[PDB]
């Protein structure tokens, strides 16, 4: 569903899911958040449209990857801020005890957001 | 606070004597402080507490005077006897009493035979009073604390009932509530019944209750002078067992089978009435064994006499014979000759001639057993040939009394386990037990003299088998007293054999070198097992309180981690948290235990992500990355020698070795490749600076893969000269795609850069460039579009991407994805799942060091998961094979602490071996238990 629709990033797929779906409300066999799945696969509009219906920025997975963590890890300058403005912003913790500053340009954004 | 107890039958004390002397009653009587206790007339069993003063009446006659026989015998399990008022002649009445009581012994020595005159006033009371005083007299800090607690060495003095709640009076007071049937909390009643059950009160409420033919039944008569207090109340409890119900307070005839009568019930007499059948014979054997265990375990009592009843013809009513004479008549011959010219022993006293043994075991001495030759000696155990197989026989020459033999086979016939020694042919005519031979014999004789055969797998098998057997013993509620290498019998020295060791107790609390510190529960057994396992691992070093230092420190034995941990966990100073043997077996049953050859902890807060071994005595070089400069560490496996040096400008990314039939080539993030002398260590120099960081080295001649795909070739002879130049540099991809992995495989080098695989021959030009991102149709983009970090190949490329659980299979010929391994799918059974290292050995298995700390390993032949070994280290970074000098594969992970675990190369083989072995043991145990009984 949203997990696969958050890879290629069709407008039609996410729009059909916008009318009906299980938005920001599922975990696949791996446990990824489909929202930040779409975030680190490297989209913008899919992530924002799924924010305006889910409004979630902190959600963990099997390894503890909250969106901010691996957003800082993957070196995405703008989508991290896009999740910062909408859905608000809160820092979180993974299972190894790592902060998004260490994984991360993004670190400076972390200081001003926090 | 000296302990004084008034012993009365009808409680004449609490009737009228208390105020004269001044349910269980406790009160203080100063003079010296004396704590007097009073007993009662509804007594059943409380004699655990047993000064004394015997109280009895005379006016009723003499039957009441001859009634304290159990009273005096409870004392040994200072006594003074006083009569009652006597005013309602008396000395003449006491004359028969005094002559009978004071004469001879058997009872405790009477201190004085005294009498009191009436309750209103007694002159003899003063005479009595000084008799109490003279014989009563013929750490402080606890006493002060003892006085303090009641306000809010004393325990045996009556101050404390150890630990108890409030005064000891309350426990006797609430026990009186049990005796009679105040208000008490229900929250602590569960604990109280446990204490109540310890006094035989529970199941049964002992205080609550208040077609035979001559020939077909066997009568066993016990005469004994008295029935001690609690004897019957406990006997009733212990004869509520089951083995292939109306009762009195004197007599519990548990009929069970209608054909298996057991009329056990009451000098005083005890009679056992059972029929002449196999079940009756067995049940008589069990009852006699239980009673003899009672009388030999707690209280002796020439003493009692044993009767056996017989009758040649039914006209005579049960002519009785002593058991000893019949024992001789059964040892020699089997019949009872009649006075006039008959009946065998098996119908008179079956347990003498062991007629109740299971039919599978009889010494069928029909020219089958052979022994007594001097060469056959194996202490009073000989070698015999039973049923054409060689066995070991132990004979009971002297003082057998048919008690050692019966108490030996009543436990040996009820233990059938592969690791418990088994019984063959329990016989009477020489009165011997025949035992299976230990072909290689006692363990200790092997440890002391045959150290050559102690392979690690054999040691683990011996320990595993002993733990299995002792777990079964503890399951059967049997405490195995004494566990040593002497009492562990090895049959075979073939490691994959099903039966390698059993445990067998040779009778002769434990020997002075192998007992638990408290010497006593199962936990003392576990301590004994820990001493055994220490003995195995050390191989008898200590053999030829307790504080046992590390075996490796002194004896120089091969370090065997996660068994030194088990030795230290079992071998604890207190029995409270040392493991139960239900779980000591579970711990020893693990291939991780079998094969984890070594584990090493690096200095604190050191990060290493690349490492190389030494090709010859063992050494390792690590590239440390905790500080963002160049940090190279040298580790020695045999003797820990971690030494870290600060070399090169930036963090070292990967090392590789080049040999000079040497040189270590360290690649740094700045891009320079720096070469260090391996032996001398002085001659050191750099090489050509590269455009970007270097990533991978060699895995082949000196291949060098940088972070822009610009793969260079460096010949073995080039590194001898400073600032060398490549034979050729071939560019494979753009700058944004680093070249990460190069692999040796039929002599072609494979590799992965960015998202593209490649291969090249000795021409050093790429002959194939496999495209892999298009495989995103399978799995999905976040995983498929990442980099490629490791590739291995034997029949298809096994590629691992950066932070992606899916490990992909790329056929070399078709150049098309034909397999993908969902690592998280394997991990769902038993915590990241993303692969971080991946190493393939021979063609048996490939090990996948997943980022969560799990070396999830597969049999690549069938794509089947063998084991999901867990390092206990939080993450794993690198996995590579080393020769050492025995093939091992050595693993490095992060916890921040970095752990380097060296594993014996065949974890998959050992997993299959141990699993098959445990299945063989399980079916063998089930079949043994099914067939034997
Ligand atoms: C009161 C009581 C006592 C024991 C038990 N008891 N409890 C158990 C278990 C709980 C463990 C089942 C077993 C038993 N009995 C036995 O173990 N008898 C036994 C006596 C003598 C020899 C063997 C023996 C068989 N083959 C051997 N081969 C070699 Cl080479 N040496 C051998 N011996 C000689 C030197 O070394 C030690 C042994 C032997 C076996 C009960 C009550």
Numbering used by the authors:
A (entry chain B): 52 to 155, 162 to 171
B (entry chain A): 1334 to 1355, 1370 to 1378, 1388 to 1406, 1414 to 1440, 1446 to 1456, 1461 to 1510, 1528 to 1541, 1575 to 1583, ...
Sentences from the paper on this structure:
Increased kinase activity of leucine-rich repeat kinase 2 (LRRK2) is associated with Parkinson’s disease (PD). Here, to our knowledge, we present the first type II kinase inhibitors that target LRRK2. We designed these inhibitors with a combinatorial chemistry approach fusing selective LRRK2 type I and promiscuous type II inhibitors using iterative cycles of synthesis supported by structural biology and activity testing. Type II inhibitors stabilize the inactive/open kinase conformation, reaching into the far back pocket of the kinase active site and disrupting a critical salt-bridge by releasing the regulatory αC helix.
Next, a chlorine atom was installed at position 2 (R3) of the 7H-pyrrolo[2,3-d]pyrimidine hinge binder to produce hybrid compound RN277 (30). To address how the new type II inhibitor RN277 (30) binds to the kinase domain of LRRK2, we determined its structure by single particle cryo-EM, using purified recombinant LRRK2RCKW. The sample was prepared in the presence of guanosine diphosphate (GDP) as a ligand for the GTPase (ROC) domain, as we had done previously. We solved this structure bound to a LRRK2-specific designed ankyrin repeat protein (DARPin). This small protein binds specifically to the WD40 domain of LRRK2 and decreases the preferential orientation of un-ligated LRRK2 on cryo-EM grids, improving particle distribution of LRRK2RCKW. Our structure of LRRK2RCKW bound to RN277 (30) revealed features of a type II inhibitor binding mode, including an open kinase conformation with the catalytic triad DYG motif “out” and a broken R-spine, and a disordered activation loop. However, we also identify some features that differ from our previously reported structure of LRRK2RCKW bound to the broad-spectrum type II inhibitor GZD-824 (21). First, the distance between K1906 and E1920 is 5.1 Å in the RN277 (30) structure, while it is 3.4 Å in the GZD-824 structure. Second, there was no well-defined density for the G-rich loop in the N-lobe of the kinase in the RN277 (30) structure, while this motif was well resolved in the GZD-824 map. Third, the Y2018 of the DYG triad showed different conformations in the two structures.
